[PDB]
RNA sequence: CUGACCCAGAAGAUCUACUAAGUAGAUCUUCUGGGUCAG
């Protein structure tokens, strides 16, 4: 067995008199340790003839699995039954028969909260020990918030019922949008109010071991200029310039479509309005339908060259020119091979009678990022005395990740480095997500003595995942929360490790330096909560759920009604009609398909399965895919692809989600498609 | 029955920028259902 130390037993001595704890601990000091201890000494506290039941929660999958690894390990010895349940292990057992026949459950939260909106685990009276992993979470709307709204509305409610004692475990408690020590106060009181914690534990007696275990990184600050001249910049903004007055052209009021005022190219603000423009443009509506078909779809085309440009703006912006023309060259690429019809043949003539210029200009060695420079500068001082160095680099989109690879790997100067690549699991428009496989692999990969000496990361690698010690912490132009920046020097806890933050904006220093200050802020409020009387600490955080509870419980609100009304779909991009909504058929309530023979000529499949665009020729616009059921291979349909308009009153409207769209949902019947 | 891959829905948190609380864009996570390949 494992040797406690003086402060892991000082953290975890509240717990074991009974008390509701939050444990605020720095990173790496052992909380999982702790968490064992606790539960160890509850187990063996029941006499004879009774027995006490455990659940921990984990909010991700990997942090779920290693969880369930330990605790088993731990005590297997003592013979107690240890399970665990999540997505991949949901479907397989009544999960009321899983909790009964075991001592020690892992689980992810919102399973719990179907099983208790279902009504298979009826009370949280079964356990007898709550542990919640960060437990900073429990705020908002978030899934440990619902569990507590769970127990909170049993304990203010007259059941004299059992509950069970509530532990949770975080580095940072956070302040919220507090100003001042007063307001962080109120903070920490309202979350210890959604916890039911009575007590906060933190290392007092044994501070020094705790530093010789932990040691806090040094903070750096790196400010840098933007370029001094931007040829790539006037190139793009002459043509944004050609674009708008070809666009201005067509429609003589474009300038009245959004109130978004003194806009400049290359910005958020400018996306904004551009984006605000192209959702006014496809709705305009006119008694002729050649007309209304042939302006809405020049208007379309205008508007994302627009926002393409606008792109590469900003990519250029924040790395090097070639990343932003490799992007418009894939961009007008696509174009050229995705119906090709005049106006996007004036539009990609007219980019390349500029293409030379734009890559003459992109491979001058003298217009390379600051950014950059700094970068390079940086790695290479601190890798010359340290050739062992272990860095973490953190940007803020997927492009970037990809980006920054190549731009070290195509740097001469910087051969000593091995890059790794860290992104999401989901999908998005222009990249395919990551698989748990594919992350274990890359996080094994990264160690010391391994494949990879540097990892590129978005916020990934921010809570939870298992990452080996770094000695090197850059944040590119990367700044969020209280604790995310707590979270995040908790990587580097190595002695004489460091991070730097490189950026070309005050703000960002500033708010990093807000950020420094309103951890003080909640350190000298825990230290005034902890002297205070348990009693009035009670009441206070009474008073708090009882006004909480009255709230929420008056907040509840109704669900209005469908229409039943037939509508139109029509082609986004050109307008033409695709179906009407008596068509429309929901399989299993998620999935939607078309049904009839007319629907079947107004779209064509060009090879996963098959994808399905417009059929009208020049347009070819992306409605949906092909999917199989049961022995059908049914076409499915996405409603950001249509411009819904009523037969009657005859406006247009634009819907992002099925949910947000109301009308009578029929649900598909296998022998119906005999009409 | 295990793995590996994909698709469709829905929910949650964070950050930035706008308009007069909502809106866009980005990042990450979770749950539900439907398929493919290998053993
Ligand atoms: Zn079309």
New binding site residues.
């Given amino acids: 067995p494992f040797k406690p130390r003086n402060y892991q037993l000082e953290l975890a001595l509240p717990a074991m008199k009974g008390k509701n704890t939050i444990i605020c601990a720095p990173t790496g000091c052992g909380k999982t340790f702790v968490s064992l201890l606790i539960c160890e000494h509850h187990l063996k506290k029941f006499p004879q003839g009774q027995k006490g039941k455990v659940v921990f929660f984990a ?3 990997p942090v779920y699995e290693q969880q369930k690894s330990v605790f088993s390990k731990y005590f297997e010895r003592h013979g107690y039954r240890v399970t665990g349940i ?2 991949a292990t ?3 057992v009544p999960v009321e028969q899983i909790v009964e026949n075991n001592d020690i459950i892992i689980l ?1 939260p ?2 719990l909260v ?1 099983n208790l909106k279902k009504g298979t685990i009826p009370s949280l009276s079964i356990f007898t020990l709550m542990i919640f992993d960060e437990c900073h ?1 429990t ?5 440990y918030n619902m569990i507590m709204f769970n127990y909170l509305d049993q304990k203010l409610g007259g059941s004299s019922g059992p509950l069970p004692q509530v532990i949770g475990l975080t580095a940072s408690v956070g302040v919220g949008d507090a100003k001042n020590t007063d307001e962080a106060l109120d903070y920490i009181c309202k979350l210890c109010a959604s916890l039911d914690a009575s007590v906060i534990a933190t290392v007092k007696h044994n501070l020094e071991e705790l530093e010789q275990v932990v040691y806090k990184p040094q903070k750096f600050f790196r400010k840098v200029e933007s370029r001094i001249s931007d040829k790539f910049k006037y190139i793009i903004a002459q043509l944004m310039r050609d674009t708008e007055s070809l666009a201005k052209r067509i429609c003589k009021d474009l300038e009245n479509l959004s ?3 003194n806009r400049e190219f290359g910005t ?2 400018y ?2 309005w551009i ?1 605000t423009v192209q959702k006014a443009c496809m709705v305009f509506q006119m008694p002729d339908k050649d007309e209304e078909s042939r302006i809405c779809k020049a208007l379309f085309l205008y508007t994302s060259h627009l926002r393409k440009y606008n792109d590469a703006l900003i990519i250029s912006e924040h790395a090097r020119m070639k990343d932003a023309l490799d992007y418009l060259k894939d961009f007008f690429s696509n174009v050229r091979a995705a119906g090709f019809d005049e106006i996007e043949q004036d539009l990609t003539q007219r980019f390349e009678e500029k293409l030379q210029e734009l890559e003459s200009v992109s491979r001058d060695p003298s217009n390379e990022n600051p950014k950059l420079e700094d970068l390079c500068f940086i790695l290479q001082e601190e890798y010359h005395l340290n050739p062992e160095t272990i860095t973490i680099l953190f940007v ?4 970037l990740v990809d980006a920054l690879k190549n731009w070290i790997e195509g740097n001469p100067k910087l051969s000593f480095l091995k890059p790794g690549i860290l ?7 222009q ?3 990551m ?5 274990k692999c890359i996080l094994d990969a990264f160690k010391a003595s391994g494949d990879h000496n540097i990892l590129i990361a ?3 690698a921010d809570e939870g995942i298992d990452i080996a010690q770094c000695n090197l912490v850059i944040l590119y132009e990367y ?3 209280v604790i ?1 920046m707590i979270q995040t020097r908790g990587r580097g806890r190595a002695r004489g490790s460091k991070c730097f933050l490189l950026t070309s904006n005050a ?1 960002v220093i500033e ?1 990093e330096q807000i950020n420094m200050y309103k951890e003080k802020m909640m350190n000298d409020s825990i230290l005034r909560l902890q002297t205070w009387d348990e009693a009035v600490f009670r009441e206070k955080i009474l008073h708090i759920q009882t006004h909480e509870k009255f709230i929420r419980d008056s907040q509840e609100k109704p669900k209005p009604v469908p229409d039943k009304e037939n509508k139109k779909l029509l082609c986004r991009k050109c307008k033409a009609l695709a179906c009407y909504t008596a068509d429309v058929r929901v399989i ?5 398909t078309v049904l009839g023979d007319a629907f079947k000529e107004c779209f064509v499949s060009r090879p ?1 399965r098959a994808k399905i665009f417009c059929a009208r020729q020049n347009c070819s616009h992306d409605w949906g ?1 092909h ?4 022995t059908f291979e049914i076409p ?1 349909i ?2 950001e692809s249509f411009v819904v308009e009523d037969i009657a009153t005859g406006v247009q409207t634009l819907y ?4 947000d769209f109301h009308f009578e949902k029929i649900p598909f019947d296998p022998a119906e498609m005999s009409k």
């Fill in positions: 909010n991700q999958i999540s997505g949901a479907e397989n992810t919102q399973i179907n979470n705020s908002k709307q978030h899934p109130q978004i005022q958020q603000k996306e904004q984006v803020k989109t997927r492009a992104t999401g699991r989901g999908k998005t428009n990249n395919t997500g698989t748990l496989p594919a992350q978005t916020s990934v700044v969020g929360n995310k703000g708010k299993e309530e998620c999935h939607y996963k895919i999917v199989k059921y049961k499915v996405k409603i992002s989600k099925w949910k």
